[PDB]
Amino acid sequence: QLEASLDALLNQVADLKNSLGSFIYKLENEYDRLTWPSVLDSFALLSGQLNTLNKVLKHEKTQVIIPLVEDLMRQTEGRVPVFSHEVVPDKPDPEVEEQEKQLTTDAARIGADAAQKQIQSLNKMCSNLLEKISKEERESESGGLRPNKQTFNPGDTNALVAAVA
Amino acid sequence: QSKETLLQSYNKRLKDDIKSIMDNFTEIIKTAKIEDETQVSRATQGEQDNYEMHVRAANIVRAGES
Amino acid sequence: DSVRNNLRSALTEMCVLYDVLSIVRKKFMTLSPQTLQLISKKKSLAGAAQILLKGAERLTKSVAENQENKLQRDFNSELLRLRQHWKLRKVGDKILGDLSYRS
Amino acid sequence: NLLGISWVDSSWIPILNSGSVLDYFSERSNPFYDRTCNNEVVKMQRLTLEHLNQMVGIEYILLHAQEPILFIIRKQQRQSPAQVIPLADYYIIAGVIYQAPDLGSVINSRVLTAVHGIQSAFDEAMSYCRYHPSTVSTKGPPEKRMRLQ
């Protein structure tokens, strides 16, 4: 059941990592060029892959992992379950610890009824208003059919041109 | 080499880039999601998606300006 | 570089996760008002808006400088002046048509 | 929590065999299970797997037994028989207490690490330098013929 979604997420993460590594190795040169040759494209690809992985993980399930009992055969070669059993536990998270501490300090820095809950509600209301305004603007701008210019009309004057008559 | 067709292609590319920049701006404005929808892993996945969307919107704005 | 090291660490973490998932695809089993998303939305919004405003201010300053001092405007400005003061330019790559008196 | 660690008792649990499984479960290193589980209740009179399933409590069962290298344990957490929910972490994988944690936490940690690294890389490579808006008469054939000689 969930194995399908697990394999899908694993393939997505592997493709993202492979694309990132290929872009890095192709544009390393021991130093990056300050002209954005492909940095924007790599950033867009990474952001899209991350958003796709997050949406797949949050959509639905379309735990515990014991030792080993052919992508995985290349890494876990020779049928070594001890490697998978020892690499599964191996996070310090030094900056994440400070972030969690600063968050759990107050999480709103002021007020109780006007805390992160009411702030998020007001932000969602403002975002809904902005999205409605943007949708109205897009529906208004979608009316543009084509830049219908105008020029001479030689089709009539040709037959209407002078002659022996 | 096809000066008129080259100018038409340049105009089409400029219009497509402008439309893509506008669509990226609209998507970044609509993907705010102030509601705490991240329930599986909030502190990790929420911040990850937020930073990714911010970097993507900044890159899209810079590319559109250029 | 630091960017290269960060990319390598991210790729290693993703590869480890993919290998663990592929192994699980061996033997698997089943085993606070922080408001993370609410604060992360505003944080990412401010972070993106900072860079956006920086780029917009840089572009506006460059445009105002190019419009103020009309002496370093080599891109198409000195070109328009020269063309109004000199011969035609058959645009094959950048310029052509010297004072060959072919007029 | 203790899933991130991979400690193992050296003097307490000298082995990870069938008989040593009870010693490893009764001696946490560092954490193995809660004190209010059914392991301490079964260890009152005599340690056995029958009394653990009979008494309603979090029992210490084995998921996969193998004396050779590793022995997957199954720390059941259920007050009813015919059910084994793994909650604690007292495995005998490679003669040591394994993590047996949920993959969601590790996946979220890896994703957050990758996102932070990518954001730092972008912020670093953003500003590096300035990227603002602002033969015909060569008759060498004679030389070639002379060099040919």
* Cα(B25)–Cα(B58) distance, integer angstroms: 9
The DSSP-derived string for A35-95 is T-SSHHHHHHHHHHHHHHHHHHHHH----EE-----HHHHHSTTS-HHHHHHHTT----HH
CB of D20 closer than 8 Å to CB of D13: yes
Cβ atoms < 10 Å from Cβ of B19: 12
SS3 A149: coil
Query: Quick one: which of B19, C20, A88, B50 has its CA closest to D72?
Result: A88
Give the gap in angstroms from C-alpha A80 to the nearest C-alpha of chain B: 31
CB burial readout D56-71, b (16+ within 10 A) else e: ebbbbbbbbeeeeebb
Interface with A, mutate which of D72, D102, D132 (most A CBs under 10 A):
D72
**If we measure between CA atoms, which residue out of B20, B11, B32 comes closest to residue B59?**
B20
- Facing residues of B2 across strands? none
User: Which residues does chain B have within 8 Å of residue D132's beta carbon, measured at their own beta carbons?
Assistant: none
Q: Look at phi and psi of residue A52 and say left if phi exceeds 0, alpha if psi is from -120 to 50, else beta.
A: alpha
Matching residue, tokens 């292609």: B9
Dihedral of alpha carbons D111, D112, D113, D114, sign: positive
Please tell me which residue of chain D has the smallest CA distance to C24.
D103
Q: Are the C-beta atoms of residues A20 and C10 closer than 8 Å to each other?
A: yes
* Distance from C-alpha of D144 to C-alpha of D149, rounded to nearest angstrom: 9
Please return the burial class of C59, using the count of CB atoms within 10 Å of its CB with bins 0-12, 13-18 and 19+: middle
How far apart are alpha carbons C49 and A132 in whole angstroms? 21
Contact of C37 with B36, CB cutoff 8 Å: yes
How far is Cα D81 from Cα D33, in angstroms, rounded to an integer?
A: 19
Task: Tell me the two tokens of residue A112.
Answer: 């109780």
Handedness of CA A69, A73, A75, A78 (dihedral sign): positive
Burial class (CB in 10 A: 0-12, 13-18, 19+), A91: middle
Provide the pairing of β-strand D61-64 with D72-74: antiparallel
Task: State both tokens at C41.
Answer: 């939305």
- Going by the DSSP 8-state scheme, the letter that residue D37 receives in this structure is S
Question: How many residues appear in chain D?
Answer: 149
With H, G, I as helix, E, B as strand and everything else as coil, classify residue D57: strand
Neighbours of D78 (CB within 10 A): 16
Closest C-alpha to A21, from C88, D117, D139: D117
Give the C-alpha separation, C65 to D134, whole Å.
Answer: 10
Which residue, B36, D16, D63, is CA-closest to A67?
D63
Contact yes or no for B45 and A51 at CB 8 A: no
Are the C-beta atoms of residues B53 and C44 closer than 8 Å to each other? yes
Q: Which helix (H) or strand (E) holds B47?
A: helix B47-65
By the 10 Å C-beta count (0-12 exposed, 13-18 middle, 19+ buried), C103 is classed as exposed
Secondary-structure percent of chain A, ordered helix, strand, coil, rounded to 5:
60, 0, 35
- Classify the C-alpha dihedral A30-A31-A37-A39 as positive or negative: positive
DSSP state of D78: B
Backbone angles phi, psi at D67, to 5 degrees: -70, -25
Distance CA D41, CA D52 (A): 8
* Alpha helical stretches, state H, C2-103: 2-24, 36-68, 77-85
Instruction: Show Cβ contacts of residue D72 under 8 Å, excluding neighbours closer than 6 positions.
Output: A66, A67, C27, D62, D63, D64, D65, D91, D92, D93, D98
The tokens describing D67, both together, are: 């004396």
CA distance A34 to chain D (A): 5
Which residues of B are less than 8 Å from D109 in CB distance?
44
**What is d(CA D63, CA D75) in angstroms, rounded to the nearest whole number?**
8
* Smallest CA–CA distance from C33 into chain B, residue: B36
Instruction: Give the closest residue to C28 by CA, choosing from A72, D24, A44.
Output: A72
Q: Is the dihedral of CA D24, D27, D28, D34 positive or negative?
A: positive
Place of tokens 């509601």: B35
* Distance separating alpha carbons of residues D83 and D77, to the nearest angstrom: 8
Kindly state whether C12 is in contact with chain D, defined as any CB-CB distance less than 8 angstroms: no
Question: CA-to-CA distance for D87 and D58, rounded, in angstroms?
Answer: 8
The position carrying tokens 């002659």 is A163
Query: What is the gyration radius of the CA atoms in chain C, in angstroms?
Result: 29
Contacts of C25 (CB under 8 A, 6+ apart): A3, A6, A7, A10, A72
Burial of A164 (0-12, 13-18, 19+ CB in 10 A): exposed
DSSP B43: I
Euclidean distance between CA atoms D32 and D24, whole angstroms? 8
C-alpha–C-alpha distance, residues A91 and A97, integer Å = 11
Technique behind this structure?
cryo-EM
Phi then psi for residue D64, to 5 deg, are -145, 120
């930073």: which residue's tokens?
B51
The string of DSSP letters for D83-128 reads: ---B-S---BGGGS------HHHHHHHHHHHHHHHHHHHHHHHHSS
Three-class secondary structure of residue D13 per DSSP: coil
C-alpha to C-alpha distance for A86 and D93, rounded to whole angstroms: 9
Contacts of A19 (CB under 8 A, 6+ apart): A42, A45, A46, A49
* Helix A2-26 × helix C2-24 angle, to 10°: 150
Degrees to nearest 5, angle at CA D75 with D73 and D76? 130
Question: Is C51 in the B-facing interface, judged by CB distances under 8 Å?
Answer: yes
C43/B47 Cβ within 8 A:
yes
Tokens at residue B63, please? Answer: 């590319």
Please tell me what resolution, in angstroms, this structure has: 4.0
Distance CA B23, CA C13 (A): 33
Distance CA A33, CA B36 (A): 39
CA distance C73 to C27: 69
- C-alpha C95/C-alpha A44 separation (Å) is 37
